């Protein structure tokens, strides 16, 4: 009952992006430029359906360099993953939560079953624990 | 065959990279905001270091942003910029056709000069076939 590394996530649908700058409540550890990616099953839930088992959402976080008032993507810091499985991850609302340092499969960041990730996402119970909304 | 096609479905293509251009940057007018670059399959072959087939398309998707408590949040789409590869049809501008679509709407074509203005800046990147964006992980 470990969350699987989402191989190939960079080929998935780009949901949205956001920049979190120093001073933001989530700066540690989510400071930087992040991109949200969704597999096919996750798109189904984002469009108004139920999230099927097998849905995966990825929070892809980069550092940025500020250069003459442009923010430029630097190195990947981590990915956060949410993997849908109603049965296996019922303790955390049907989603398994994991982080991978530098986006590497052997650098697992979560040490508490995903409880700390879940505690913040629980605020989005009404939208099946997902913050991100589909835009055009 | 003289016009760049609107790239229907580009939001489902591969996300190459992003960048933010803030006030004070030389390109804030007209490329200020958060932009994302997308590539179709044919464009990927070219970005990977292979050659660009005719039919390759690269999309520059530009959003305004809002400042919200040390976050930059995506606002309204300002425009999309499109490069469509056709070595024969678009030979006057280096084998790419250039178009801009206001607010990303198919009916709001922006380019009036056959893409010469667009090409004039892209011409500096001759050695990478007029493409600035690089693949990252
Ligand atoms: C609040 C204090 C949070 C904690 C702790 C965690 N996350 Fe979260 N997450 C948060 C917000 C406000 C957002 C939206 C970001 C945006 O661009 O709008 C997210 C997003 C995710 C995503 C993308 C899917 C979604 O819900 O929007 C993933 C995959 C994600 N978060 C995973 C994740 C993991 C693995 C966490 C513990 C290591 C975790 N999050 C904690 C807010 C908060
Ligand atoms: C310099 C003054 C430019 C003019 C005028 C135009 N473009 Fe360009 N473009 C420029 C840069 C520096 C970049 C890279 C942005 C990044 O994130 O690295 C781009 C990129 C594009 C792309 C993406 C493909 C690529 O070459 O990286 C497209 C599709 C694109 N630009 C199209 C485009 C059009 C249609 C233009 C005239 C309306 C145009 N550009 C002008 C720099 C400059
Ligand atoms: Zn402050
Ligand atoms: Zn600045």
TrEMBL record, chain A:
Pfam families associated with the record: Cytochrome_P460
Residues that coordinate or bind Zn(2+) 2: 66, 69
Molecular-function GO terms, alphabetical: metal ion binding
InterPro entries: Cytochrome_P460, Cytochrome_P460_sp
Ranges where the Cytochrome P460 domain occurs: 6-132
Database matches in CDD domains: cyt_c'_beta
Residues at which Zn(2+) 1 binds: 27
Binding positions for heme c per the UniProt entry: 16, 34, 117, 120-121, 131-132
Top-level taxon of the source organism: Bacteria
Keywords: Heme, Iron, Metal-binding, Zinc
Chain residues that bind Zn(2+) 3: 69
Name of protein: Cytochrome c
Biological source species: Methylococcus capsulatus (strain ATCC 33009 / NCIMB 11132 / Bath)
């Amino acid at each position: 009952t470990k969350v699987k590394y989402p191989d190939g996530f960079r080929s998935w649908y780009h949901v949205k992006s956001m920049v979190i700058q120093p001073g933001h409540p989530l700066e540690n550890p989510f400071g930087g430029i992040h991109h949200v990616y969704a597999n096919a099953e996750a798109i189904q839930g984002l469009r108004g359906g139920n999230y099927p088992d097998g849905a995966v959402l990825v929070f892809d976080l980069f550092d940025y360099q500020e250069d003459n008032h442009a923010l430029v993507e630097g190195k990947r810091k981590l990915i956060g993953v949410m993997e849908r499985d109603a049965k296996r991850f019922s303790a955390t609302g049907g989603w398994g939560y994991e982080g991978f340092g530098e986006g590497k499969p052997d650098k697992r960041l979560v040490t508490d079953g995903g409880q700390g990730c879940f505690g913040c996402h629980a605020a989005q119970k009404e939208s099946q624990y997902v913050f991100s909304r589909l835009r055009d």
